Write a protein that binds this ligand. Sequence first.
Ligand code: GDP
Ligand code: GDP
Lengths: 306, 306
Amino acid sequence: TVDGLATAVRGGDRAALPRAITLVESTRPDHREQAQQLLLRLLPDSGNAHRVGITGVPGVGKSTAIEALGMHLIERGHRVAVLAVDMARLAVHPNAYIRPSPGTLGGVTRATRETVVLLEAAGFDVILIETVGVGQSEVAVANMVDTFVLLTLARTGDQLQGIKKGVLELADIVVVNKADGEHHKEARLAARELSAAIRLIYPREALWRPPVLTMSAVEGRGLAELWDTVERHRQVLTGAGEFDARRRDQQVDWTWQLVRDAVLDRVWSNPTVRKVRSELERRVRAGELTPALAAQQILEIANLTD
Amino acid sequence: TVDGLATAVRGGDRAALPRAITLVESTRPDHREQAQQLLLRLLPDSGNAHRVGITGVPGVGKSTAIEALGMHLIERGHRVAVLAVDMARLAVHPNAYIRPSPGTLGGVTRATRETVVLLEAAGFDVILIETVGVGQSEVAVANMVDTFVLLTLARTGDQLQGIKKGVLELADIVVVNKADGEHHKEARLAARELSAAIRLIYPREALWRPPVLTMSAVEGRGLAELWDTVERHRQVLTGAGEFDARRRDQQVDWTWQLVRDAVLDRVWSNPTVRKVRSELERRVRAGELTPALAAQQILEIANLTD
Ligand SMILES: Nc1nc2c(ncn2[C@@H]2O[C@H](COP(=O)(O)OP(=O)(O)O)[C@@H](O)[C@H]2O)c(=O)[nH]1
Ligand SMILES: Nc1nc2c(ncn2[C@@H]2O[C@H](COP(=O)(O)OP(=O)(O)O)[C@@H](O)[C@H]2O)c(=O)[nH]1
């Protein structure tokens, strides 16, 4: 039973956890309902953790950094979980848990958010959530974590190559990675350039202006200082009452997103609407039909076949 | 009749236009339906214009710049309309039309977008759309124009004071205003700093990297060069086939936004949902209820009272 599973999860049973996550990842209407009851039971045991999101372009070094950070943390007495929303030395360790990405963005987002509750209830005190680069995936992850970390390249004038614009402003901390080999001095200059842009984007910020750090994830340099900064972010926000405020706001926002997706899905997933979408859009693109009149036809058609 | 009004608008009757806009601004269900028929008739006569959005903080100088730009353009044979989404020398002129902002953002957005169609049909070839600073108002205006212009302050390290973060990335052109009095050299340095950040945000952009210009709207300096740059934006995008692409994409996006707002409004505007919102949100904030379970209760309650 749900009541049994909850007891085994919070008591720390290593076999219960993956079964609980499996229940949460299921989109069968029977499973969703018990999942919701299980999460209700475990919600009071959650929240005692720091949730950190980590993003950056393919090949910037996210997996290398996460592995090195995960070991740094395990050696300091933390229990560390890694999730991906789309590391062999780490996976070995009993105080780590690593899980691959679970359909749509809404769906992977929901499954990830619910899995966080389970991990925290199971005693994990650090949750690292990696993007797979792009969807609206960066925003989704930023909205479920306490501290969002952007990794960039350590090259003057080229740090943000390949990043979706607007992602810089999501970051609580920015890191220039691969500050090694022929790019030690270059990395400092590249960090100073990003710092200059961050001062322009946050010119009179008084609580937290995102720091720009350098790192060599492959040589294991800069991970400790990155975590020191993640802790300082939490301390600063907590002293201002904003750490809890951010979480409460994210939960209310997610509630309304669930309401939105439920009501919009009826229209979007409607086979007949899917059939006529192309032609209705073509008519709009060609100025043969107004957006308002095309919207009305979409709604009428959904309603006739719902 | 709608058929009569359309003939008078496209034939250039100055009395028909404000009546047509009045019909469009009405949210009475009878008016909305004729408005839609009128827009359908005039849609083929629209599109022959450059739509420019203009944003920046209160007091940066938007109204001063728009007045000076509007006169620059009128003197060059254009017919210029000014709309606001929330100038005495300009209002005097027969080849200008100025209209104050029309409920919600969705509502003002819809009325503004429809009014654009009417103005273009009436022979206006430049449409300037001013924000009133913030809502999600900047995004709304950027999504209905061809060229989005951000005005900022001409002070080194303080150009973006008061701007919602993420707004910089909406801009097709950035202008440092008030490059006058004691800030002539400072303005050049402030422009160079923004240019440096723009290079970092757009490091390998090949089609259009947003230029940063200086201006003194109050002394009438820099308006001509601002318009020269707006024309160059259109020429560059047109040569790449992106000018028409942007418009078609905005229209399809607006269509789906209308569908979204129709379906979400049923829930949001429901009196009973409004009544229980506070307590449901409090329960979510306190960890007494899951987002998914709160969403379900919101949907059930809407459905019971719909
Ligand atoms: N020079 C250098 N290479 C790195 C660093 N971190 C990762 N790499 C290399 O970059 C490649 C991609 O790294 P990976 O961690 O898989 O990047 P990911 O795609 O972001 O997860 C691999 O060859 C890594 O060895 C670093 O700090 N310096
Ligand atoms: N020094 C200087 N003042 C300006 C300039 N443009 C506008 N102003 C002044 O700034 C104040 C606000 O200008 P206004 O155009 O109303 O700004 P708005 O709120 O953005 O529409 C007024 O006192 C203007 O005279 C400029 O280029 N230089």
